[PDB]
Structures are given as structure tokens and as C-alpha cells.
């Protein structure tokens, strides 16, 4: 019917009258701020904090918990739903972490959605504008399809490395950040395939199948050490923090940053390829976004913990040392890729400068944070041996 059969309390005369009659004269408490008991990180409590902090029902025996008692149901054997035993790191409060970008679900999907729709528009303009005409054929059919495509499995592996953390994170603010760091990784992997799928549509004989780039990843030589480092961070690490720290503050910060920024983002332009940089712009925007969160968790919160500062830095320097070796090994195997570029593309002088950029950025943004004395020359020297 025009009015419908269901009567609603807000608009139905009879029901609304009853409701209004039961209402108090004024609110029964003047404190209308949800999450008012949460300690603000900034001037005033933000929506991000109100909606997230303390959502996880931890009891006081898990640093920061507000609840009490044991869990109601545990694993066969006795392992708690969540426990201090799932990570080497210790702290006075697992809820101190704060994403500098203050991302809860709404802002997060809003931003990624904008990127998806702009990406769509870009591709429609790129194809209509015929910009593919100026792209170097070899760079496309060989370095984008095979080597860039192969890198998608690297990102995909770092994505999965976040799975256990999604389950074991000891707080809400940390679980949310972790989930977003991982989701952005799968996004990048899917964007690599999307570019290959786009090329397939506008380039007559281009094959989008992942057969070629996958074989390169699983059997090739350039990404061999890269894949070994990935299979390890993902399936050999059972400590959620070691996994996140080592993936973001070690491996991806060195290997990942070099490949994306110092290789494809630096060379693609020279072959008339502005398509790939479009997507790498996203990956780098994502990298710098996650970096602020990674820094806040491991340095501001854990690394500088009022009670476990020394302890945690020791554990992280230990992890840094543990994975710095497989990372450098990955960077070496990758160096072999330069020999496949047409003559005159780049020189050992430029690469050395690009390596120092990555290493120096790493030391400045990560290594020095936990007082991990690293030697730029030795590392760069170690990597250069792969040419």
C-alpha cells in the first residue's frame, strides 16, 4: 500500500505519543562522549580512537586489558584465545599504538575507492589518447610482462605473511593497522595483474596469463633469493610481530623499495612507459602510509616502551640482523637483471647512487630507530657484487 502496514515508533501518532510520554526531561548523564576514558594521543580524542580502542576484550593479564578472568573457551591443550605467548615483544600496554593517519574502516575504503575510480578513468583516457604508441616494445613484452609481473608474487607473499597477525594481534589498534598493511599489499599485486590485463586489451598479441611471470618467480634467477626470503617471512615465522617488523622495517624497506622505486619507477620512464609508474605511485603512496604506522608501533610504542625499551630494541636488532642477510641476498640476485637491459640504459654509477638512496633511507627511517649499527658501504658493496 501507499502507507505500508508496518507502524514506526518515530512517525506513528499513537506509538510516538507513548514514547514521548516516557522520555525524561533531560539526558540522564551529561557525558555524551563515547570512549571518554580512553587516553587521547592528540589534543582531543578522535573518532578513530573512540570507535577502535578497547574493542578487543582483553583482560588485565594482557598488558593494557581492562577485563578480568581467563577466556571462556580455549584451544584443545589450553592455549588462550589471545596471549602474551604469541610474540617475543613485551609492553606496558598493547593499546598505545595509533595509526598516524587515523584510519578506521570508513576512511580506508573511501580512499581506496577513490583510487579505483580514478584508476578506471585514467585507463580509459590512456587508451583513448593512444599513449601506448610511444612505449618501448621490448620494455613492455619483456620487462613489464615478465619481471614486473613476477614481482606480483612477491607482494602476494608479503600479503599472506599478515594472515597470522590478523589472528594473533594483541589489540584493536594493532589489528586494524596490520589488516590494512596487508590489504594494501594484495591490492598492489592485483594492480600488477590489472596492468598486464590492460596491456592485453590494447596490445594485439599481449598475453595476460600469469604463466610467464609466475615461472620467472618460481624458477628464474633474478627473484630466487627474493622468493626464499618471502616463503620464510610468511610460513616460517610464527611470531606476529617478527613477521610484521621484518616485512616492513627490513625486507620491503630495502628489497621492495629498491625494485619499485629505484628500478621500475626509475627506468620505466626512460622507455616511454608512464603506465607502470601510475601504479607504482600507488604502491609508494601505500608504502609511505604503512611506514608511519610501522614506525609508531615498533619505535614510538615498543622500541621506546617505558619499561621494555631495552628489551624490545634488543629483540628487533636481533630480527633486523636475522633478516637483513636474506634481504641483501635478494638484492644481489636482483642485480642480475641489469645485464638484461639494452646497452646504455643505466650505468654502475647510477645504480650505486640508487642503492645508497635505499640504504640511507632505511638507516634513517628504521635502523637508527633501534640503534642497529649498520654499515652503508658494506651493505651496498655486498649487493653490488651481484652485477
Amino acid at each position: 500500500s501507499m502507507l505500508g502496514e508496518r507502524r514506526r515508533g518515530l512517525t506513528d501518532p499513537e506509538m510516538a505519543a507513548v514514547i514521548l510520554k516516557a522520555l525524561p526531561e533531560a539526558p540522564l548523564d551529561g557525558n555524551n562522549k563515547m570512549g571518554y576514558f580512553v587516553t587521547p594521543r592528540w589534543k582531543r580524542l578522535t573518532e578513530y580512537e573512540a570507535l577502535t580502542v578497547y574493542a578487543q576484550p582483553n583482560a588485565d593479564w594482557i598488558a593494557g586489558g581492562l577485563d578480568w578472568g581467563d577466556w571462556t573457551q580455549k584451544f584443545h591443550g589450553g592455549r588462550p584465545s589471545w596471549g602474551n605467548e604469541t610474540t617475543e615483544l613485551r609492553t606496558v600496554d598493547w593499546f598505545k599504538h595509533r595509526d598516524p593517519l587515523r584510519r578506521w574502516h570508513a576512511p580506508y575504503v573511501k580512499d581506496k575507492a577513490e583510487e579505483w575510480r580514478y584508476t578506471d578513468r585514467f585507463l580509459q583516457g590512456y587508451s583513448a589518447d593512444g599513449q601506448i604508441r610511444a612505449m618501448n616494445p621490448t620494455w613492455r613484452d619483456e620487462f613489464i610482462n615478465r619481471y614486473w609481473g613476477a614481482f606480483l608474487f612477491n607482494e602476494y607473499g608479503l600479503f599472506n605473511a599478515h594472515s597470522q597477525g590478523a589472528r594473533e594481534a594483541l589489540s584493536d589498534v594493532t589489528r586494524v593497522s596490520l589488516a590494512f598493511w596487508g590489504f594494501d599489499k594484495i591490492d598492489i599485486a592485483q594492480m600488477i595483474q590489472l596492468e598486464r590485463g590492460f596491456l592485453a586489451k590494447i596490445v594485439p598479441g599481449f598475453d595476460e596469463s600469469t604463466a610467464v611471470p609466475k615461472a620467472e618467480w618460481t624458477n628464474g634467477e633474478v627473484y630466487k633469493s627474493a622468493r626464499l626470503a618471502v616463503e620464510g617471512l610468511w610460513q616460517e615465522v610464527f611470531d606476529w610481530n617478527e613477521s610484521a617488523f621484518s616485512v616492513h622495517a627490513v625486507y620491503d624497506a630495502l628489497f621492495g623499495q629498491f625494485v619499485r622505486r629505484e628500478f621500475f619507477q626509475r627506468l620505466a620512464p626512460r622507455f616511454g612507459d608512464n603506465l607502470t609508474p601510475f601504479f607504482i605511485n600507488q604502491a609508494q603512496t601505500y608504502f609511505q602510509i604503512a611506514k608511519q604506522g610501522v614506525q609508531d608501533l615498533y619505535y614510538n610504542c615498543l622500541g621506546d616502551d617505558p619499561e621494555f625499551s631495552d628489551y624490545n630494541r634488543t629483540v628487533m636488532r636481533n630480527w633486523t640482523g636475522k633478516w637483513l642477510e636474506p634481504t641483501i641476498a635478494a638484492l644481489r640476485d636482483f642485480m642480475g637483471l641489469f645485464a638484461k637491459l639494452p646497452a646504455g640504459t643505466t650505468d654502475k654509477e647510477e645504480i650505486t647512487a640508487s642503492l645508497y638512496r635505499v640504504v640511507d633511507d632505511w638507516i634513517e627511517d628504521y635502523a637508527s630507530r633501534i640503534d642497529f649499527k649498520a654499515d652503508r658501504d658494506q651493505i651496498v658493496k655486498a649487493v653490488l657484487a651481484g652485477l
Partner: protein, 511 residues
């Protein structure tokens, strides 16, 4: 050919399955009895960016309605007092369910070996994060714009005071993440979502609308639009292990344990919240429960999984037998212990008592008379010196907490089930309310060691527990919880302290 061209989600998802590769240690990090097939597919072909877009669109409408029209209509205020209180519980308790589901699906993501199945679970991981924030927003909105922000503004800490919370954690926290990944999947998706949450969410918007609340429908209806992906995840979980020989050996047991676990809490709790936490009624819980559990889930849904070796829970008939009076029996206990909540409760008015008797013949002679007795004695008046728990003590009606489900029960007074099993094991007493939970503890004692409120609060004076756990309103003297929903004569910490109520562990009476 310079025709405008692009690429969509499906065209990329096309190659998603090939994203995973083989290598020695490529296996789940979690203990499990089953083997998820590495070629399992997913129903919805999505990629991260398209997922974001479809959810962003929903957020747009939802938040737009909330911040604009609904606020202009003073929708946060023009809600019946009883329902404003009920949403403190509904929104926050569901929030933890949404929150733990994040970790749960993360565990399932780790369990799946097929790239597509992992992607399906992943989509839910993000959805449950969205749902956590949505339920939080409901409480946030009612705190900011409603008639009583206390409870809506601090449930994350004030919920720890009462006994109803413990049971919530069992079915919506631990039940979702502690155990075989597959068992958790059954608690969360196969049972939790398919049998309860999904229908519940919609039902909640119906009771909300009837009581003047247009806020909850706006948010919960948006949450509901995501549930079809989660149903598929649960359905696909079974499809993934259907071939594994271990399935025929363990599936039906984990499921039955899962079914009992979820129904044990929601059968009494949801019915109680709907019928006793509202003024206007939508439908009698007995009718609702029968349709959900027997007709829709037990019949249609479970039936479609038959080809996969899935059978109706053996404890199904038992659940129906125990159900009829369950929610009525529970409210008596919830109201008797009202000072331990973080919300205000009300006794049934005349029209409601008539509604209860009409829909539950025999209600008045038992529950009705008790409520009128407590009221005439002054349970609503702070100067009476009376809280219903005293009546339970006086009439020798001990209240126990099931060691497994954490559900409070009083076999001495219950009109429903009244079985009771008490055991001692290595210097510790245990109380059970049914044969299924008893078996669970006996077979898996180390999985259930949760301290109950009587154990934790033993020897403590009531007002001290409340003060310590911050069960007070802004003025620091008035209780958040109340035995009525009127604006005058609110109980204070002093009114409680004067009662000199000290907790005792009821199980010690058997020593």
C-alpha cells in the same frame, strides 16, 4: 583502435587462483583435523579496490542519513527508554562478535590453501572490521545524541561487571577463535551467522523501528548487505573439506558442538532482550525461534549441505525442549542482579503482562506474580533496601553459572530446564546445566577454566565491585544500572552499600 578501455575486478580475479605457489612449508600454521582442498573457488570475484568501492557507497548513504536527516529529526532522542537501554547491550555485545570475527576469518584465511578461498575469507576480515566500527558507531551516536549516554559511552569496560557478558564472549569471542579452525568456522559462519546473526540483525531493525529507533535500522540494514559473502564463506568451508576422509569422522560432531554452543546463549538472551527490553512488540520469541532454528536453519540451510555429509545436530530436539521458557527464566536472574549491569531495566507494565500471558499461557502465575511481589516490596525505590537477589537468598534459590557456556541458571526456580550436575576435580568444583556442556568439560577440561562472577567477587561487598569497575555515571555517585527506566529516583552507590550485599560462591554449599 583508441576506444576508451579499462579492466574490471572479474578480469583480474580470473587469475587470482594462480597467485599462490608451492613450497615445502606452504601450509596452515594452525592445528586442525581437516584438509581444505587447494583448488577451492569463491562465489564473488572481487579484488581489493572493487571491494572498497562497493563498501564506500554503502557508508556514504548510512553516514549521510545519520549526520543529516536523522539528526535533524532528533532520531537519537525520540526512542523508548527501554530500547535506548537495550541497544547498549545489543550494539556492544554484537560489536565483540564483529571484532573477534576479524581474527577468526584471519585464522581461516591462514587455513585456506587455495588463493580464491583465502580471498573470500579476506573480504570478510575487512567486512568484520567495518561491522566492528558500525556497531561502535551506533553506541557512539546514542551516547552523543541520546537520552542516556551512560553505558553507551563506556560499555567496553562497564560490561565486565555483569554475568551476561561472560556468555557473550563464549559464543562471540572465544567460540569464534579458539579451537580447530573448522570448528570456529562452524560457530561463526555455519551456525552463528547462518542460523542467528543474519536473521537477528534484520529482526533487531524491526524491534528498533517499532520502538522509535531509526538509527539502528540505518546501520544494521547496511551491515546485513554484507552477510551473503560470509554465508558463502561458511558454505565453502564445508565444500573445502567434504572430500577429506577426516570430515566424515569429525564434521558432524564439531557442528553439533557448535550448534549447542551458539543456541545455549542466544535462545534465552535474544528472546529476553527483545521481549523485555522493548515497549512495542513485533513477534513472540517462541514463534521466531522455531522459524529460525527449525524451519530456516535446521531445515533449508542444513539440508543443502546434506550432499556433503552434514547432518542435523543430534542435540536439536534437546534445544527445542529447553527453549520454551529459557528467556523468561533468564530475565528473572538478570533483573535480580540488575546492579551488575551497564544498562537500565524495567519490569513489565500492565499491557505487557497481558501480552506475555496471551503468548505464553502460564506466564502470569509464575513470572508475573513474582514481578508484582518485587515491585510492591519496592525493588524500584532506592529507599526500600531491597534488590531481588535478596529474594533468591531468602527463598533458597541458588543461582549458578554453567562452567562451559557461562549462562546463569537457577534450577530451583526455573520453569524450563532444571537439571544440575556438580563435580569436583583436583580441588575445584564445577557446575553444569546440561548434558552437552558437561561432556565438553569432561572431555576437554583444559579448554574451560573461566572463573565465574561468584568466584571472582566472592567475599566482596557489592558496591565495592561496582565502584572499582567504574559502574558509575558522571557525577560519580549514581549507578549506571537501574531497576527502572524513569528519570527520577535513581539508585546511587550509597543505596547499594547500605544493602550490605556480599557475594558468595553457591557451589560451596555442597561442601
Amino acid at each position: 583502435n583508441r576506444a576508451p578501455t579499462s579492466v574490471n575486478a572479474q578480469e583480474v580475479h580470473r587469475w587470482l587462483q594462480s597467485f599462490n605457489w608451492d613450497f615445502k612449508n606452504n601450509r596452515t600454521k594452525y592445528a586442525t583435523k581437516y584438509k581444505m582442498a587447494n583448488e577451492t573457488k569463491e562465489q564473488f570475484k572481487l579484488i581489493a579496490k572493487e571491494y572498497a568501492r562497493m563498501e564506500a557507497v554503502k557508508d556514504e548513504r548510512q553516514f549521510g542519513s545519520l549526520q543529516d536527516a536523522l539528526t535533524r529529526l532528533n532520531a537519537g532522542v525520540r526512542v523508548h527508554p527501554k530500547w535506548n537501554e537495550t541497544m547498549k547491550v545489543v550494539s556492544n555485545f554484537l560489536e565483540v562478535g564483529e571484532y573477534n570475527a576479524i581474527a577468526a576469518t584471519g585464522m581461516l584465511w591462514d587455513s585456506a590453501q587455495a588463493a580464491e578461498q583465502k580471498n573470500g575469507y579476506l573480504a570478510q576480515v575487512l567486512d568484520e572490521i567495518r561491522h566492528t566500527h558500525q556497531c561502535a558507531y551506533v553506541n557512539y551516536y546514542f551516547a552523543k545524541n541520546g537520552q542516556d549516554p551512560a553505558g553507551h559511552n563506556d560499555a567496553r569496560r562497564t560490561r565486565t561487571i555483569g554475568p551476561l557478558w561472560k556468555g557473550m564472549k563464549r559464543v562471540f569471542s572465544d567460540g569464534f577463535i579458539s579451537g580447530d579452525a573448522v570448528e570456529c568456522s562452524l560457530n561463526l559462519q555455519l551456525v552463528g551467522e547462518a542460523c542467528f546473526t543474519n536473521p537477528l540483525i534484520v529482526a533487531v531493525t524491526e524491534w528498533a523501528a517499532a520502538n522509535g529507533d531509526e538509527i539502528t535500522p540505518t546501520v544494521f540494514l547496511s551491515i546485513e548487505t554484507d552477510e551473503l559473502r560470509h554465508m558463502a564463506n561458511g558454505y565453502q568451508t564445508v565444500v573445502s573439506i567434504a572430500n577429506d576422509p577426516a570430515s566424515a569422522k569429525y564434521l558432524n560432531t564439531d557442528l553439533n558442538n557448535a550448534f549447542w554452543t551458539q543456541q545455549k546463549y542466544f535462545t534465552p538472551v535474544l528472546g529476553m532482550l527483545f521481549e523485555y527490553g522493548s515497549k512495542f512488540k513485533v513477534e513472540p520469541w517462541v514463534k521466531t525461534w522455531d522459524r529460525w532454528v527449525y524451519e530456516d536453519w535446521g531445515g533449508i540451510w542444513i539440508g543443502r549441505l546434506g550432499k556433503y555429509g552434514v547432518e542435523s545436530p543430534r542435540s536439536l530436539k534437546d534445544a527445542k525442549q529447553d527453549a520454551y521458557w529459557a528467556h523468561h527464566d533468564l530475565y528473572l536472574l538478570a533483573y535480580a542482579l540488575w546492579p551488575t549491569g551497564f544498562f537500565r531495566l524495567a519490569l513489565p507494565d500492565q499491557e505487557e503482562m497481558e501480552w506475555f500471558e496471551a503468548n505464553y499461557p502460564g506466564w502470569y502465575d509464575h513470572y508475573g506474580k513474582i514481578y508484582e511481589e518485587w515491585r510492591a516490596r519496592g525493588c524500584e525505590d532506592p529507599s526500600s533496601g531491597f534488590i531481588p537477589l535478596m529474594w533468591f537468598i531468602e527463598n533458597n534459590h541458588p543461582i549458578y553459572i554453567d562452567r562451559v557456556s557461562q549462562v546463569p541458571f537457577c534450577p530451583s526456580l526455573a520453569k524450563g530446564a532444571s537439571t544440575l550436575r556438580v563435580h569436583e576435580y583436583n580441588g575445584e568444583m564445577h557446575t553444569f546445566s546440561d548434558q552437552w556442556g558437561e561432556r565438553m568439560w569432561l572431555a576437554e577440561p583444559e579448554r574451560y577454566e573461566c572463573q565465574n562472577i561468584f568466584e571472582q567477587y566472592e567475599g566482596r561487598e557489592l558496591s565495592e565491585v561496582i565502584a572499582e569497575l567504574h559502574g558509575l555515571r558522571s557525577d560519580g555517585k549514581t549507578l549506571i544500572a537501574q531497576p527502572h527506566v524513569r528519570g527520577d529516583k535513581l539508585w546511587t552507590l550509597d543505596d547499594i552499600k547500605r544493602l550490605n550485599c556480599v557475594f558468595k560462591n553457591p557451589v560451596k554449599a555442597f561442601n
